[PDB]
Design an enzyme around this catalytic site. Structure first.
Site, PDB file in Angstrom:
ATOM      1  CG  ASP B   7      -1.515   1.294   1.505  1.00 44.97           C
ATOM      2  OD1 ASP B   7      -2.396   1.765   0.745  1.00 44.97           O
ATOM      3  OD2 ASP B   7      -1.055   1.882   2.484  1.00 44.97           O
ATOM      4  CG  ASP B   9      -0.942   8.441   1.162  1.00 41.58           C
ATOM      5  OD1 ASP B   9      -0.907   8.713  -0.083  1.00 41.58           O
ATOM      6  OD2 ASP B   9      -0.668   9.277   2.086  1.00 41.58           O
ATOM      7  CG  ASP B 219      -2.084   2.395   6.727  1.00 42.00           C
ATOM      8  OD1 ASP B 219      -1.795   2.155   5.551  1.00 42.00           O
ATOM      9  OD2 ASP B 219      -2.825   3.343   7.084  1.00 42.00           O
TER      10      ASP B 219
HETATM   11 MG   LIG Z   1      -2.698   3.320   3.580  1.00 47.94          MG
END
Ligand SMILES: [Mg+2]
Ligand SMILES: OC[C@H]1O[C@H](O[C@H]2[C@H](O)[C@@H](O)[C@@H](O)O[C@@H]2CO)[C@H](O)[C@@H](O)[C@@H]1O
EC number: 3.1.3.48
Lengths: 539, 255
Positions: B7, B9, B219
């Site tokens: 991922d 960001d 996250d």
């Molecule tokens: Mg993210």
């Protein structure tokens, strides 16, 4: 938690645990403190696993080589014997249990492997390893074999590997250098090669373990074996006319056994630290205490001077100390665990033909060095689970084994341990794992295969010939999948059961309608499903 | 063999959390410094996207993947093609869409290791200064993620792919401005903006096959659920420490 006002003691299953329990009885009579002796499997690995949680025995017995690791893990209470007491045991035995200047256990006895031989078959035992193939030929003519000893534990094969130059960690400048490992040199290769050739040339079998070797020598089927003093009392019982003597030389050099000092440590988590001290110093480490244990299974050359003066007159003890003096006292450093792990793998792989000696030892060198140098960084349970799943999916089972070894003090881990156990042919440990924990339905298929494949392997070996379809059918019947890893209309039933595991009679009729089953079938399914869920709670 | 599905960001980069204030609060940093860095980076991203990657043209017709556009594109050289003058779902329109993505691919490949050259002076100097302040504010987050990515990059049977909720074109600008261009081939980048990550994970599995091991790193709950669905091991990056732990596992070849 360890019970205050009691003593729990762990000692290996090959030692005199019944005699030790006798000392415990005398202790209890005097003090009112009941003593319980246990000999669990894989004790050396189980202690750190359970002591870590503050659980486990009050007192732990093993060879001293495991103790540095325990102390570094904070598992051991420092022991406080006074000058008077220390003076009663030989200085070199205290050395074996000294770690960074601190005494971390009580030394009990010196263990060294010796050559044990049948004097009826072999009044003049071979002075050299080299003469053993020829001797075996001669004996095979008479229905006998020259030598059988445990080939599963590297403890027993190390004397030969070390003879011409193998070593664990190089000692220099007052310390063991954990960057200088000696399992891969010319000497080590020569030794392991000689061993493998013994197996190739049909003088030994790669599958021989402790029990098989013991049974054969004690039945007079083999002229020689390699074992420690603990083994002598079973030989007494067998009435074999045995001698205990110096190990054979290799390339003109003595076999060099790694010498152990049986030691007793106190669990740092024990609420009974003063009682443990009283037991060890005032009951066990006395002429009468050691004699009781020794009578059960011989301890070897005991650390207690007063009693060793008497045992040293025994030719079996003389031979024990001769072998010890030609071998080397094991280091007690934490890295000994990595050493034994790596070497265990290599000997097994080389002996079985899976790898060449050169390849097996090269990998052992790399692994021992790398494992001995691992940083102390800890991963979370979720991270450990992720690693376990990745290494399995990648088929990196050797890496997975070493990763599991590294875990300090969840389902993913248990599944990983089972896969590794299967990979190693440790089927007893595999079954223990599979049976002792409930597993998630999505893990069942893989775990079922391990259970089945292992049982087929075991059955086929007992049969001496390939298992066919009917044979496999019979194995399946004899060893059903445990409920820990085994349980369209079902679809409707399962979704309904989650809402309400107790349908009414009308609800059963509606369900029978929706599934095409009878109400009797619906009822049975629900009853069974409730029973199974209950069985799974109990785990 | 090993496909690492990243991922963007709050996993590899810190960006969006600079704008919202959550990075500053979670890591004890000055909120003012944080938002200022975030705003400046946001401007550079949109500026790069508009100026070089046709973002004004492509904003409402962006793609999941750079090779998605079906057209009669003949492969003609576009180095002298006048995008401003070509009048951009018919045949002609699709070809002009396709031209832009092919050109975007050329630019990315040309400038992935020369972002300073792409944006020019004085933007280059402002960018480099901003990247240095970013590392100080975030305690070397990007420095650490780059180390993990490059470690993976250096291994024989491993590949890095990126699945982001950012639209493709601005995601490319981010990837460039954050120094990720040399680790990620443009063909390894997928935008889940319209379709959701699950669909992108499926494209990835179709591409690399059923023998590969897929490791999902993020996250967010979306990549986590995607991982669970396809039995892909998942390594959560809930905080900077989880990234350092990832680096340790990679170094020891546990992953
Ligand atoms: Mg993210
Ligand atoms: O095989 C490696 C193993 O060797 C030693 O274990 C010995 C032990 O010292 C003896 O008391 C006897 O019980 O046999 C054991 C081998 O089966 C080391 O002490 C041990 O740490 C090591 O793993």
């Amino acid at each position: 938690k360890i019970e205050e006002g009691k003593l729990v003691i762990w000692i290996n299953g090959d030692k005199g645990y019944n005699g030790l329990a006798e000392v415990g009885k005398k202790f209890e009579k005097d003090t009112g403190i009941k003593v319980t002796v246990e000999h669990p499997d894989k004790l050396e690995e189980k202690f750190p696993q359970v002591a870590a949680t503050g659980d486990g025995p009050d007192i732990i017995f093993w060879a001293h080589d495991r103790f540095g690791g325990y102390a570094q893990s904070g598992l051991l209470a420092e022991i406080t014997p006074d000058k008077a007491f220390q003076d009663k045991l030989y200085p070199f035995t205290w050395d074996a249990v000294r770690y960074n200047g601190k005494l971390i256990a009580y030394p009990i006895a010196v263990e060294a492997l010796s050559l044990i031989y049948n004097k009826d078959l072999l009044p003049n035992p071979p002075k050299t390893w080299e003469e053993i193939p020829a001797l075996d030929k001669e004996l095979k003519a008479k229905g006998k074999s020259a030598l059988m000893f445990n080939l599963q534990e590297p403890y027993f094969t190390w004397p030969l590997i070390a003879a011409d130059g193998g070593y664990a960690f190089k000692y220099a400048a007052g310390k063991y250098d954990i960057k200088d490992v000696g399992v891969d040199n010319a000497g080590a290769k020569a030794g392991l090669t000689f061993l493998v050739d013994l197996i190739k040339n049909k003088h030994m079998n790669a599958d021989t373990d402790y029990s098989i070797a013991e049974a054969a020598f004690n039945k007079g089927e083999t002229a020689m074996t390699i074992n420690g003093p603990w083994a002598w009392s079973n030989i007494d019982t067998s009435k074999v006319n045995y001698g205990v003597t110096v190990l054979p030389t290799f390339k003109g050099q003595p076999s060099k056994p790694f010498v152990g000092v049986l030691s007793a440590g106190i669990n740092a988590a024990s609420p009974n630290k003063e009682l443990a001290k009283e037991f060890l110093e005032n009951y066990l480490l006395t002429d009468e205490g050691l004699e009781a244990v020794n009578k059960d299974k011989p301890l070897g050359a005991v650390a207690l001077k007063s009693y060793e003066e008497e045992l040293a007159k025994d030719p079996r003890i003389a031979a024990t100390m001769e072998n010890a003096q030609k071998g080397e006292i094991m280091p007690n450093i934490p890295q000994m665990s990595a050493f034994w792990y790596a070497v265990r793998t290599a000997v097994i792989n080389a002996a079985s033909g899976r790898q060449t000696v050169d390849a097996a030892l090269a990998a052992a060198q790399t692994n021992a060095a790398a494992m001995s140098m691992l940083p102390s960084f800890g991963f979370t349970q979720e991270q450990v689970a992720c690693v376990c799943e990745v290494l399995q999916q990648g088929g990196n089972l050797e890496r997975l084994g070493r990763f599991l070894w590294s875990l300090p003090a969840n389902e993913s881990v248990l599944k990983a341990k089972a896969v590794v156990a299967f990979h190693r042919g440790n089927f007893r440990e595999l079954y223990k794992i599979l049976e002792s924990h409930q597993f998630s339905p999505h893990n069942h298929p893989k775990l079922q295969q391990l259970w089945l494949k292992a049982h087929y392997v075991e059955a086929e070996k007992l049969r001496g010939r390939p298992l066919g379809a009917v044979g496999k059918y019979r194995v399946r019947r004899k060893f059903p999948l445990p409920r820990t890893i085994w349980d369209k209309s079902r679809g409707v039933l399962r979704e309904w059961y989650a809402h309400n595991p107790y349908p009414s009679p009308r609800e059963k009729r509606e369900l029978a309608e929706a599934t095409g089953l009878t109400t009797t079938q619906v009822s049975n399914w629900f009853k069974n499903r409730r029973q199974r869920d209950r069985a799974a709670e109990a785990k | 063999e090993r496909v690492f599905v990243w991922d963007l960001d709050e996993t590899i980069i810190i960006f969006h959390s600079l704008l919202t204030g959550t990075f500053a609060s979670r890591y004890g940093k000055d909120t003012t410094t944080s938002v200022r860095i975030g705003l400046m980076m946001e401007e550079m991203i949109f500026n790069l996207a508009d100026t070089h990657l046709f973002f004004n043209d492509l904003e409402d017709c962006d793609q999941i993947h750079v090779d998605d556009v079906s057209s009669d594109d003949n492969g003609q050289d576009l180095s002298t093609y006048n995008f401003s003058a070509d009048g951009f779902g018919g045949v002609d329109w699709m070809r002009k869409l396709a031209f832009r993505y092919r050109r975007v691919k050329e630019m990315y490949n040309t400038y992935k290791n020369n972002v300073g050259g792409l944006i020019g002076t004085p933007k280059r100097e402002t960018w480099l200064q901003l990247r240095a302040e970013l590392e100080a504010l975030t305690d070397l987050w990007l420095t650490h993620s780059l180390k993990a990515l490059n470690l993976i990059n250096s291994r024989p049977n491993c590949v890095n792919v990126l699945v982001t909720t950012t639209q493709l074109i601005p995601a490319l600008a981010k990837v460039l401005l954050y120094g990720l261009g040399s680790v990620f081939p443009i063909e390894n980048i997928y935008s889940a903006t319209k379709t959701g990550k699950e669909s992108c994970f499926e494209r990835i599995m179709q591409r690399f096959g059923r023998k590969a091991v897929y490791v999902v790193i993020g996250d967010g709950v979306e990549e986590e659920q995607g991982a669970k669905k396809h039995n892909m091991p998942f390594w959560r990056i809930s905080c900077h420490a989880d990234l350092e732990a990832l680096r340790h596992a990679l170094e020891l070849e546990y992953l």
